[PDB]
Amino acid sequence: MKFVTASYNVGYPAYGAKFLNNDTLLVAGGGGEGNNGIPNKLTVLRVDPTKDTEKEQFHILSEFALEDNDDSPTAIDASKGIILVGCNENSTKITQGKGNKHLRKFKYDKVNDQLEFLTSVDFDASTNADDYTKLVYISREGTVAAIASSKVPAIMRIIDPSDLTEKFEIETRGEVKDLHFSTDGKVVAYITGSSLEVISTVTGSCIARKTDFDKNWSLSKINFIADDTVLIAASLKKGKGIVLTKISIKSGNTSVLRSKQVTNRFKGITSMDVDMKGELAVLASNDNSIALVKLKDLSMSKIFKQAHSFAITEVTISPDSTYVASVSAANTIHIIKLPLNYAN
Ligand SMILES: [K+]
Ligand SMILES: [K+]
């Protein structure tokens, strides 16, 4: 079975990507703070991998130049017009205590193809330039968001993405590997390497947790796939493989619905996304593959080998499930076009 694919070098190491609509892709990344002449940017592209030339396949609509001597962005998300970007200021500034407005709010003006900076905030008050914003997610309705820094033990901050105010701070036990919101925004679930923690975004209260996973599993990624159901991807510590598990969440309780080792071909994964329909998952592996997983069967149906040269940093599915995009620190964007209703 053949898939239409296309690739493009965006000109800088890419660390984040998100579809803004069915064919418009936001990419973020950069050369970092050094005097290397490699910019730090947000780029909005219209994608159509069926066109004849790379410039037609990847049509640049807008670019926003971040500071040349800013760090490169590390994480982004977008919902309901709000774009949130995690990006450190210059390291000297951070270390001196001048402030680090590391969570930034942008919008993209569709009518005009213009990106605009709106506001930014220093949430962490960090003076350690080695710490960065590892996770940024916004809920589907766009009224709550969560961020988490790279520092361990991690703090997860639940925030209002309209004005960048903090709702509350969650002091977690150790490293936060990933997090995701329920579609109604009322619940946030996060994972450490060995546990699932489920928290109310309304009260900050604990809803449920699970710590009794197989001792050979290192939890890696989490996404909601139905109202009260999460998909967790884990890697094997000893041996090689990826396990996917579906877990329902109740007040005070969780239940494992279904679990399957979907492959022994990958040691780890760098990124995962699930489509709006909850039918398709996409994985990026440590060895630079993109994999398609049909969730109804938990079956890995296709692997694209060497989709990027190294360091796939994010994979994202368009809202209509037509396109899978991935980006990498090797400066490339890879697009796969999927058949209608593929995940069935
Ligand atoms: K630079
Ligand atoms: K996630």
Q: How many angstroms separate the CA atoms of 148 and 133, rounded?
A: 6
Q: How much distance in Å is there from the Cα of 105 to the middle of ligand 1?
A: 21
Pairing of strands 269-274, 280-285: antiparallel
Pairing of strands 178-181, 187-191: antiparallel
The token duo for 80 is: 């309901």
**What is the stated resolution of the deposited model, in angstroms?**
1.4
Q: How was this structure determined?
A: X-ray
Q: What is the DSSP letter of 99?
A: -
> Cα torsion for 259, 260, 262, 263, to the nearest 10°?
120
Place of tokens 């905030």: 121
Q: How many angstroms separate the CA atoms of 215 and 287, rounded?
A: 24
Q: How many angstroms separate the CA atoms of 337 and 318, rounded?
A: 10
User: Could you tell me the residue ranges of all domains in the chain?
Assistant: 2-344
Q: How many angstroms separate the CA atoms of 336 and 7, rounded?
A: 9
Is-cis flag, bond preceding 319, omega within 30? no
Query: What are the backbone dihedrals phi and psi of residue 118, each rounded to the nearest 5 degrees, phi first?
Result: -110, -55
Q: How much distance in Å is there from the Cα of 30 to the middle of ligand 1?
A: 7
Name 200's Cβ contacts closer than 8 Å, sequence gap at least 6: 186, 187, 206, 207
Q: How many angstroms separate the CA atoms of 306 and 71, rounded?
A: 28
CATH of span 2-344: 2.130.10.10
SS3 82: strand
Q: Looking at the CA of 66, which ligand is closest?
A: 1
Residues facing residue 18 across a β-bridge: 26
CB 147 within 8 A of CB 86: yes
**Sequence positions preceding breaks in the chain, C–N over 2.5 Å:** none
Q: How much distance in Å is there from the Cα of 34 to the middle of ligand 2?
A: 30
SS3 264: coil
**Residue 191 burial (CB < 10 Å; 0-12/13-18/19+)?**
buried
